[PDB]
Amino acid sequence: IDTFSRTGPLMEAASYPAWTQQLIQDCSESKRRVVEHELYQRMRDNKLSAKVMRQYLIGGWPVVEQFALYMAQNLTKTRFARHPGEDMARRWLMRNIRVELNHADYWVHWSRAHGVTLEDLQAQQVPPELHALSHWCWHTSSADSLIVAIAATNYAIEGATGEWSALVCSNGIYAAAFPEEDRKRAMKWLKMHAQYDDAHPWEALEIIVTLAGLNPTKALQAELRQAICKSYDYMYLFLERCMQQEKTAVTRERLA
Amino acid sequence: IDTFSRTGPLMEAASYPAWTQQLIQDCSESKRRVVEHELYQRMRDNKLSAKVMRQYLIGGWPVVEQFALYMAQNLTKTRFARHPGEDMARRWLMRNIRVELNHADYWVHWSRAHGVTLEDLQAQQVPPELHALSHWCWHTSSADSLIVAIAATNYAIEGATGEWSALVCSNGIYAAAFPEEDRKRAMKWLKMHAQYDDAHPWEALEIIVTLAGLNPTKALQAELRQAICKSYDYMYLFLERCMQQEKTAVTRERLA
Ligand SMILES: CCCCCCCCC[C@@H](O)CC(=O)O
Ligand SMILES: CCCCCCCCC[C@@H](O)CC(=O)O
């Protein structure tokens, strides 16, 4: 019947089939270059220029603002009792849409701590490299199967985001640099996403595996791999463009 | 600025503008003939034929199964901070999608207590009069503005459903007719919807009023009125067809 049911711990690759473990391996370099990106090492250390911090916060906003909408669009593809993976997806999406309730508000507060206003967020004056991620996310959510779109969003983006947010928070410098009275409100978005035991991406993976089963086609596996790597690669494109702006901003002041 | 902010209690028509009070009045007969329908008086009294009870449970299923999907489709139309009514709608829909988590399961349990299996539900062998409501709900959710689709679903259908479910539960006969060991599980869907102080439709109305403001166009008001009455009128069409089947079923046995 090719039916998957997890036996081992949620948050261990070994609890999933060989093909899923292969998928993780095949996407690992694409993931690594995002979650260990120089931009995040610099942000961790409070080094980023005002220009780049502003571009980061504005550029990230559409994905943040629309994240529960990707989930909604995926929920719209599901039907009750059509497949055990589909029931799992339905329930999870209905629970996790609520989880995001205040997250866009937190991003607005984070932004305001760097002088980025709601008007700035809404204006979206940033380079096109920074918007590609949002366009991909809407396209997959709109047009692809649930399994692929969930892989692109709740697995790839949320998983990477747990890790980069943890890296930003990892040594206390960034947080301690905010004045005490501003810090809790400024840091809230980061703190909500940086939490060592984030079951969310593993829960997403479990849904994907249940949908796909023990023996998915090579074609389906390639579709998943390409969607996951596309999400990472658009995060990488965003980060590379920000670092080009960083090097210019910092060099200008060094030479002045 | 035409901005609406409620001062009075949530669940009183007088807390809303004159146009909203007019809207309620204009839709009142359409509503009444559903919420006081003979079919529900009979169901209350455990009188309905097996044939009709089965048709009711199968026919209602698509709307039940898809209800959180209508909400999802409406959430997809919203954007952060574009309008105060839209922020209200976004937050409410994100909270209330979760509320429906188990409701389709409860309907399956209610159905099974009348010998209607999941297979029966999925097969959807009922007259077309019974499916019209589901087609309307998807069409408005897919194609209409948020305000109109919310009016059609969370206001009209959920409001009427609070009232008809309360009527079915109102004298204890229907519930007491189930064997004790089966009763809690059979009655759960009804009980969850029959609760005297159901703020859900009033919350929906508040969102609609906030979206529309103090002085909506006559055209927008007519769109709301026609959408709300269409939802009621499709419930009425469903109920009228069921009662035609009831009269035939009962008459056949009376004459036998
Ligand atoms: C370079 C990446 C910038 C985009 C990050 C988007 C993270 C989305 C996280 C998701 O949980 C929604 C949210 O809470 O903001
Ligand atoms: C004649 C009406 C039959 C359709 C009733 C649909 C009621 C939908 C209620 C909504 O809360 C979803 C649910 O919980 O089943």
Ligand SMILES: [O-][O-]
């Ligand atoms: O996603 O938090």
Ligand SMILES: [O-][O-]
């Ligand atoms: O809707 O409960």
Ligand SMILES: [Fe+3]
């Ligand atoms: Fe989030």
Ligand SMILES: [Fe+3]
């Ligand atoms: Fe419900």
